[PDB]
């Protein structure tokens, strides 16, 4: 249907690459003698000139940019991030893909008010993967994410680096953060506020830029796809502009939780909100050609319900040079890793129905606001469970996300006989797309940390109104590991604290080296991640 947003100069602006975020300090952990990397991120308003001949757009971002800066963290290095609210509305930061403790996970009620900060303590122990950090504040997640609060967080491993995949952040390893928004006649954003169905957007962005281009050499690139959109799901394919409907082969090498067992040879990649897939595309057969990254129409080929607009079939263009300036020393091995699948279970699956209760998006008829009814499962730590995730309806779709865990996709059924499990769903995931009339069974090890955690649809409009619930990963009273201060996301020890902007700017008072060192060393003495030690 007709584009609503003003006409944009398609494929004229280079793909931006978010800068790498550097830590301010390293603090010695008195428990293990190891360095903890400490970072400061300032959430603040800013403007950006999106449309060259109109006015600017009003954004609110991590470090006053969108996307937020990219984290690059080696496995085995703990991190503390001080997220400072210098904005207009509350925030709650979630590191999506991290088995963080409950009070460091972005629980939707665990908010930071403007004029406060919160210290988040992250483990960085899981398999190498593409994580992302984003806002999660109750009922305002869609607008906070839409206006800029999302960024990438790469967890690295020298063992994965030994596979010799295309490498170098911004060189041959390229972030591909997808969003879908709508602009006013004078080039500002159309707010998501008021939307209760879905906010599709008619302008496709990569790394915050509408319909960009990038100059590439005729060789292999690693692309890290993230769907950070409010409500748009995608069916991605590549085509030569000389044959714009002919899909070009590529390889999927990783899903939400890390590498697949083997690369999946693919010409069409379904990707829904909060999913990450890493692709290697080989431009060597396309020297001197322009390759367009495109998006399926027909509501993602009948899997979705999304509205399609005049230019939502287009993502970006790659302009391929005639030769390389350096040899392509990269490869995609046929064997990537032994995926650490959970033990199979015989426990009858738990059922969760994603639908509506009057106008509200619900789980088993419950809204997250309903404190009394929203705790839908008690799961003893160490248990494996199958969850049967049911979309009975034809009128919407739901990418379901479970915090804490990685899971195996066991099965997909479709009431439209449309598809089953996709080859790139063969590994470990933390989001799974329930297309029209789809039921998916997932299998997860509820481990290794006890606490109250969220699960929800990741369509941010559904999520806010109000399709989210909780589970409790439970332990007995003789379980140790300081569990009594780590199970409750609202535990007073880990709450947000007020700050004065002068002290932040001067790096004085509670931002002094001495004050930060004492705070982080005190936090480290509680040993939040010890139950994951190997
Ligand atoms: C989620 O699960 C955790 C358990 O993994 C629940 O925490 C446990 O709650 C019980 C009952 O409140 C606590 O036992 C109580 O201890 C107090 C203090 O000694 C005592 O006065 C009571 O008679 C009772 O024995 C237990 O200590 C606590 N465990 C931990 C590790 O903190 C938690 O309540 C569940 N959360 C929700 C929201 O249901
Ligand atoms: C659970 O969390 C508590 C509280 O953070 C941990 O207890 C703390 O353990 C630290 C060691 O990191 C104790 O510090 C000690 O200070 C004394 C001097 O006062 C010094 O001689 C020792 O060498 C050490 O530095 C700290 O006092 C202690 N605090 C309390 C209130 O007990 C505890 O280890 C954690 N337990 C687990 C199972 O994680
Ligand atoms: Cu998320
Ligand atoms: Cu998450
Ligand atoms: Cu949904
Ligand atoms: Cu969540
Ligand atoms: K140090
Ligand atoms: Na595979």
Numbering used by the authors: 1 to 534
Please, what does the article write about this entry?
Bilirubin oxidase (MvBOx; EC 1.3.3.5) from the ascomycete plant pathogen Myrothecium verrucaria (Albifimbria verrucaria) is a member of the blue multicopper oxidase family (MCO). MCOs are capable of oxidizing various organic and/or inorganic substrates and reducing oxygen to water without release of reactive oxygen species. MvBOx, composed of 534 amino acid residues, consists of three cupredoxin-like domains with four copper ions forming two active sites. T1Cu is connected with the trinuclear cluster (TNC), composed of one type II (T2Cu) and two type III (T3Cu) copper ions, via a conserved His–Cys–His motif (serving as electron transfer path).
Trp396 was mutated to alanine (MvBOxW396A) in order to enable direct solvent access to His398, to phenylalanine (MvBOxW396F) in order to introduce an aromatic residue not capable of crosslink formation, and to aspartic acid (MvBOxW396D) in order to disrupt this site by introducing negative charge. In the structure W396A:FECN, a ferricyanide ion is bound in the same site but shifted towards the T1Cu site, with the closest observed distance to T1Cu now being 9.2 Å, and interacting through a water molecule with His398 which coordinates T1Cu. It still interacts with the main chain nitrogen atoms of Asn394 and Gly395 but now through two of its cyanide moieties. It also interacts with the main chain nitrogen atom of Ala396 and with Arg356 via two adjacent cyanide moieties. The main difference in binding of ferricyanide between MvBOxWT and MvBOxW396A lies in the fact that the replacement of Trp by Ala allows ferricyanide to bind closer to T1Cu. Ferricyanide in the W396A mutant interacts with T1Cu-coordinating His398 through a water molecule, possibly mediating electron transfer. Ferricyanide (product) binds in the same site in both MvBOxWT and MvBOxW396A, although in two different poses. And even if Trp396 forms a part of the ferricyanide binding site in the wild type, it is not necessary for its binding. Although the adduct is probably involved in electron transfer in MvBOxWT, its presence is not crucial in the case of ferrocyanide oxidation as electron transfer can be realized using another path, possibly via the protein main chain of the loop forming OS1 (residues 394–398) or via water molecule in the case of W396A:FECN. The W396A mutant binds bilirubin with a lower affinity when compared to the wild type.
